Amino acid sequence: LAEHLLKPLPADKQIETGPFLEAVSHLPPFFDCLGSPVFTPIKADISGNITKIKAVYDTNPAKFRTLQNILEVEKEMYGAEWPKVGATLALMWLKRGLRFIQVFLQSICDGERDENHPNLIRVNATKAYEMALKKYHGWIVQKIFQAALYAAPYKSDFLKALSKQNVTEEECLEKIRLFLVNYTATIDVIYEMYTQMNAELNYKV
Ligand SMILES: CCCCCCCCCC
Ligand SMILES: CCCCCCCC
């Protein structure tokens, strides 16, 4: 995770598409080692979105040099169906999965815990879901997340699974904190871009 850091934001706060996709494509694999088949559809959604954006990018790397480029070009390209189309729509849902990972990881690092059951990650996962995904899910998908939550490893095993490696828990969390710097900054910029472009949508699934 400290092996595949996201680049820092350039001065103009424009995110290069190529480098961005490469960076985040290292994230899906971490779902395989949460030790449950329950997490496979979650991996699939994040991968699929990354793959959707990559495919739009590949058609014209220069036209789609930056994430901003993607949104402005596709807006012009699709008139009235935008923002509910193309790579704009893929990235709208990618950012939410990425924000989820962000909030979950920051929560853990901040020493947030259920005092009653302290070696679990339920409370961190629950917060991340509430902050990133919950308002865009109908009640059925919510009840599904609730169930999926019990497949979560212990905090202790999860951190041991990320050092996959001769390292203490505190060392491991320091590494995650370093990763969260440019990660958070980058996601914050993508979210800000959806707000300025008016490209954010609120439909539930
Ligand atoms: C570093 C990427 C790890 C992803 C965290 C996902 C945990 C999900 C619990 C529901
Ligand atoms: C460089 C991006 C390629 C698409 C990867 C799919 C997500 C694992």
Curated annotation (Swiss-Prot):
Entry keyword set: Acetylation, Cytoplasm, Lipid transport, Repeat, Transport
Molecular function GO terms recorded: ceramide 1-phosphate binding; ceramide 1-phosphate transfer activity; glycolipid binding; glycolipid transfer activity; identical protein binding; lipid binding; lipid transfer activity
Lineage: Eukaryota, Metazoa, Chordata, Craniata, Vertebrata
Name of protein: Glycolipid transfer protein
Gene from which this protein is expressed: GLTP
Record-listed beta-D-galactosyl-(1->4)-beta-D-glucosyl-(1<->1)-N-[(9Z)-octadecenoyl]-sphing-4-enine binding positions: D45, I46, S47, G48, N49, I50, T51, K52, H137, Y203
Sequence repeats: from-to residues: 42-52, 53-63
PANTHER family hit by this protein: GLYCOLIPID TRANSFER PROTEIN (PTHR10219:SF97), GLYCOLIPID TRANSFER PROTEIN-RELATED (PTHR10219)
Outcome (variant: L162R): 46% decrease in activity
Effect of W93F: Partial inactivation; 63% residual activity
Subcellular location per the Swiss-Prot or TrEMBL entry: Cytoplasm
Classification via Gene3D superfamilies: Glycolipid transfer protein
GO terms (BP aspect): ceramide transport; intermembrane lipid transfer; response to immobilization stress
